[PDB]
């Protein structure tokens, strides 16, 4: 169905990056009409500035140097009931570092009842030269190797001891 | 529906005549849709005159031929739509019809009473 996965907080310079904004309706069978607005605040600055708005299968961009001609749409397509609002940056630069706000403005349609909702998701992204490897992968591989070696050494020692014992028994007999 | 009315009612001059009309309907009588239609005709092939109706509440048309002697003596919720005629006079003789409509019951009810007034 729909799963709200968090966006990755690390983007490498010069390559492409996609910022995930997934907001799933609490009941899937309901019908709604959603549009989104994205806001960006750079490091060294304390004000959040709007950079794009998406509504009715057309993307509107604000006139900002840091995001002009580098961002496209990676969200839900072909519908007004958008549950994926993620965008895509083509050439990540050092001024794209900062924290983002994804404003989702969903208008539910019930029987004689319209509910206007709003959710916000915050994404902080780091721009570095080289993709830092996750601690999880490194530590997990290290424990895999140490466990394999420990099990092998334990097993080998046990076979050595048992072979010595049975050899002594054979000489005794 | 089953409508329980007396075929012929004999009432003395000057006495009070209760006109019994009850119906057996499965569905509860909801006052916002229930319909009751009381008419009066001199003969079977004669004209019917509206004198009482329940559309949301008891509406008394106050016919001149009845003066203010027509009153409601039933309760719709208990399947009773009877009416009473105070101080019966000789010209009250005729045929009284009680038409019942109780949604969502499809059929239409009709009870016919021949009121004969003796000396």
């Amino acid at each position: 169905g729909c799963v709200e996965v968090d966006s990755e907080t690390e983007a490498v310079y010069g390559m492409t990056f996609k910022i995930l904004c997934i907001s799933c309706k609490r009941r899937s069978e309901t019908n709604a009409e959603t549009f989104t607005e994205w806001t960006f605040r750079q490091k060294g600055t304390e004000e959040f500035v709007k950079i794009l708005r998406y509504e009715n299968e057309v993307l509107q961009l604000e006139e900002d140097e840091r995001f002009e001609g580098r961002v496209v749409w990676n969200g839900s397509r072909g519908t007004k009931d958008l549950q994926d609002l993620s965008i895509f940056i083509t050439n990540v630069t050092y001024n794209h570092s900062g924290d983002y706000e994804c404003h989702v403005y969903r208008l539910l349609f019930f029987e004689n009842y319209e509910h206007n909702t709003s959710v916000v998701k915050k994404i902080h992204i780091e721009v570095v030269d080289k993709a830092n490897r996750d601690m999880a992968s490194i530590v997990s591989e290290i424990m895999m190797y140490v466990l394999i070696v420990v099990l092998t050494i334990w097993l080998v020692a046990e076979m050595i001891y048992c072979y010595k014992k049975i050899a002594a028994a054979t000489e005794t007999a | 529906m089953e409508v329980t009315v007396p075929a012929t009612l004999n009432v003395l001059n000057g006495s009070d005549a209760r006109l019994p009309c009850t119906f057996n309907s499965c569905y509860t009588v909801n006052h916002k849709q229930f319909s009751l239609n009381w008419t009066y005709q001199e003969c079977n092939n004669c004209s019917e005159e509206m004198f009482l109706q329940f559309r949301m509440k008891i509406i008394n048309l106050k016919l001149e031929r009845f003066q203010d002697r027509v009153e409601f003596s039933g309760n719709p919720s208990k399947y009773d739509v009877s009416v009473m005629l105070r101080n019966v006079q000789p010209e009250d003789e005729g045929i009284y019809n009680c038409y019942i409509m109780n949604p969502p019951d499809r059929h239409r009810g009709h009870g016919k009473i021949h009121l004969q007034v003796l000396m």
Partner: protein, 1273 residues
Amino acid sequence: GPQSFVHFTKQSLALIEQRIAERKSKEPKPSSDLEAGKQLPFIYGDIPPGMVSEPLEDLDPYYADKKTFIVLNKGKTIFRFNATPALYMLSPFSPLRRISIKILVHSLFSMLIMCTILTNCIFMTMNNPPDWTKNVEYTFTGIYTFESLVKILARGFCVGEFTFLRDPWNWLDFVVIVFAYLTEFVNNVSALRTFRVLRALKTISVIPGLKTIVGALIQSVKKLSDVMILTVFCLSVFALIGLQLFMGNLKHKCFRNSLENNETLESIMNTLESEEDFRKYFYYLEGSKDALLCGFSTDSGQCPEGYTCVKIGRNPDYGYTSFDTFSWAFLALFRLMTQDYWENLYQQTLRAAGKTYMIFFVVVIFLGSFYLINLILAVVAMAYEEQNQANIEEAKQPYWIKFKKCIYFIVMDPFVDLAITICIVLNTLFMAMEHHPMTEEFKNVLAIGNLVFTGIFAAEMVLKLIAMDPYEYFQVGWNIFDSLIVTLSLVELFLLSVLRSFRLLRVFKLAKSWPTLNMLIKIIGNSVGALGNLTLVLAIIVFIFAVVGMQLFGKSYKECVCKINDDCTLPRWHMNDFFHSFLIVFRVLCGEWIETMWDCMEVAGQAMCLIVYMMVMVIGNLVVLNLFLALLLSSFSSDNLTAIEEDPDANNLQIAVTRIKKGINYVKQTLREFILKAFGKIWWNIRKTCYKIVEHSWFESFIVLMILLSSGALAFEDIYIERKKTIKIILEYADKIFTYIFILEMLLKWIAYGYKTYFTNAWCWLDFLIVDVSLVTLVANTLGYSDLGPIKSLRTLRALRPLRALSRFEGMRVVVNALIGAIPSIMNVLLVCLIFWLIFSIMGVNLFAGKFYECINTTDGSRFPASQVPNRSECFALMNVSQNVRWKNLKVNFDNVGLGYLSLLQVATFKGWTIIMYAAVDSVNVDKQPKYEYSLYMYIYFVVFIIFGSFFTLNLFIGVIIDNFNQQKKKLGGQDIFMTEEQKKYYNAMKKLGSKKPQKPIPRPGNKIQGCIFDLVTNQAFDISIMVLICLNMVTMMVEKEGQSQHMTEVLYWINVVFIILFTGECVLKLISLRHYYFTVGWNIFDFVVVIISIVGMFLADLIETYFVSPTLFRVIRLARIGRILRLVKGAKGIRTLLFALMMSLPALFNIGLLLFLVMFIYAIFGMSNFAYVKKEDGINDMFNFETFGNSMICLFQITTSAGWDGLLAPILNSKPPDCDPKKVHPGSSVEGDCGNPSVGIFYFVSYIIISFLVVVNMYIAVILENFSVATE
């Protein structure tokens, strides 16, 4: 002797009176052979011509002293009457009484009354009788008055001993006649017809041998006394638990937040009548009569945005589904015990209270619906077994001649009969190729094939008829049956659709050579043979129930119709006419009564429908169970006695087999002859070391632990795995480690055991296959082949790692060993069932191929009428016109034989069958729009299939399962097959518990006051007062209800406190008196423990309700109140014995439950891998799906009882648009498409239900062995 025949004269009466006078002045059992309503013994020979139908003396010496006389008819049936004058007017010698006796004792009397009763029963089936029925009703009344007057005149009225009124069945006739006359003179019409239906019960007293069946059915009930008491007790305890847990939960609704005009919930709730206005404030799913249920926990149902969960309004299902009062809670628990639509209640309760309460349903199902049904069923089995044992114990105590002989020679067993068998098989396979989208060429070839087969069968028919004499030919029943089949074949050749399917009955001709098909034929024959009376009684009961229901509730369904149907038309199931009333009764007998009961209670009131439905269920289920048991054991033991040899006359098939053994072997040997004419201690120590390591206990424990870890690692791969990056990486690397470890284990086993020993073991082969698949997957992932389609379909086979746990646990190993031992016998009964079901599948395909298509309005899912769009072409005009139009067809239907098999499986299990039957009865033709109940009497097909392919099929299956497990037990010495050796020792240790001799009496204390306490507490009066106090406490807990005032809450709280102070006090008195001997008895230990839990739980619940906010925890600890009522089993000895039987049966049930849980785990992993992204429709929704491990286990536990498996299967059967979307984008995942794989889904669900059925049968038989062992020891 035979010479003892003399007319009853006045001299004999004088002698009898003189003997009576002598006996009075002075101031034993009779011959059962001479007992009333019996045949006269053959020792008396024939009767003198002047002796028959005349008053003659008493043969029995017992009544020779009293004043009686016997009369004999022409069938040697004695009747015992009274010599005292009938009402002091008519004497035995009077001609009037002579004529009355003559009429009473005759065949034309009984036949006339039988015909009258049958005609009257036929006339009761009419719901709106015309005006020419009243004279017929007067005629029926007169005929009954005639027989009543004759019996009164002949036998006397009441004064005597063998009189009219003494016969208990004559009271029914008196009641009928008085009701008829009195109600006729006085003038509810429906009541007068509920009094007229009693005439249908006179069939029992006029058809011979039915009173015996009725008496046996009464006897079978009396043995069920204690099991019924235990069932009531368990249902009440579970109802109290459910009342405590779920009081008011089914009244949660999603109420909107923003209300205009300064409105509030309380103000709105008083001005709402219609669902059209309820829908504007509460949230309804489209097409739902009830509001959507919600909960306040995170594991319950979730409201849409803009709605908040609130407890207000009525309960679901017209308000009849609830746990609000003890009455409705008991109804719900009875529903759960009978498993009637229990999955709906299970789903509603999980939605309203949370998924964590599935434990309650697991415990309730396994304890009630399994064990209590087992108890009732086994007790009925004992009763009928004792009845049968007593029965058998007492019962034992020129040119024409030339060419006809030539034709007779042409008839030759080895080939001609084998050729006919081959032709029958070919013919049935040929008629199994029919399908709906069939070209004209295929239809033509099928027609010519069916013509040629009929021609050759008729050639056989005529050739045999001219070979043997026609009188000789029609001697054999098989020849007669073949003749009927052939003549109907010619009849249909000269000419319906059902007549084409009477040719499939020739398949039963293979029963001559197939032994287990002959068993089914014998069961079916016994149903109308040795057990014809019981089947006739069942039919009579069904007819009476149908007509009673039609009379009572028929007019209510019509007048009160708008309450149960929005269109104000009669629903699919009703009792307006006889056919639909009978359909309701048959559906109830199948096991579905709650849904029709809701409509009945809506139209006609709760009490009447409740009484009628409970009585129908009780009586019908009892009679069906007795019929099943009689059939089962008759065909099991009585029919098979090996009286004759295996095919005593050498079977033609066996003669052909012998000829083939001669011929093929001889030809091959001659061909061989023609061909011949034409032409190192160190390695042994290493092996010992590996043996030492592998066989040690630590290695076994390590491997078991790693198997558990690897199996549990599969439960984490749900649709949320991309929110858990860290655990996903850890699981990948752990999987690598597991593969390494199992490679090492395989190598160690190879070196220790050797290739021969390793590969002769099946468990080792299973481990080898699993580890090989894992190694191939790892090497493919390493070499970059991680996204290939075959590799991606291989990576779903990791769901089979839990199969490594089978060889590690002894319980699963012994259960699997028993199952594999059972397999071979199951296979043959499976083949017979497939043949029987193939016959019905071909019939259903012939009846319904391509007729389930309809033109529907998609947005609301309603079939268009037949006045507009009655054809496919009109449907296409409207599709290309109105957008939301579709000419779709049912997913499960009779288009071909395989889909017919699926439909038959749905019908036999009664899951999803109703849609099929509606489509079948609405069917018109191919490419024709269905009309409402156009083919109404197609319900007969489903009724007949249910009977034959469910009742008899399951009878055969269990009949073979009984012998299989009996021979399994015999070969190993009678030990239990489901238990391990240690479990056997503990089983013996538990057996000695329930058989201890009376222990040493507790010694009294020397003190005076302590001695008084001893003589007090040890009295039985103390114990019975304790039982009545516990019963009063039970009533106090039953008084509690939803919405009760605070005054009632305080009163009940103080009463419970008083009970606690009484019970705790009684514990202190017993402790003071019995001193340390109080703890020497386990029951007093339980009492002390439960009084401690009661005090502690009451204090803790008060603390939480006063100084904390946790309603869930409050209810969970307030459940400790139940323990006080569990002490009632101490006084009830019978229910204690059944509980002891359950305790003895627990270990084997534990082993089978471990096996079932492992299978469920494997299927859960497979379902998570496959059906995680299938469209959420039918049984798949936001809470009951295959997205997570918890949801998968929720869904699999539900269909373990087969409940709702069709609703789960239906969304998977979507494979192509517009049913599904192959390019559906799911946010947060890379999986594309919401379609299902129909073949995988079908195999999944069918295999799971079959395996669950087998495992449930295993648990059944385990409980039966324990039950019979306990009661007969």
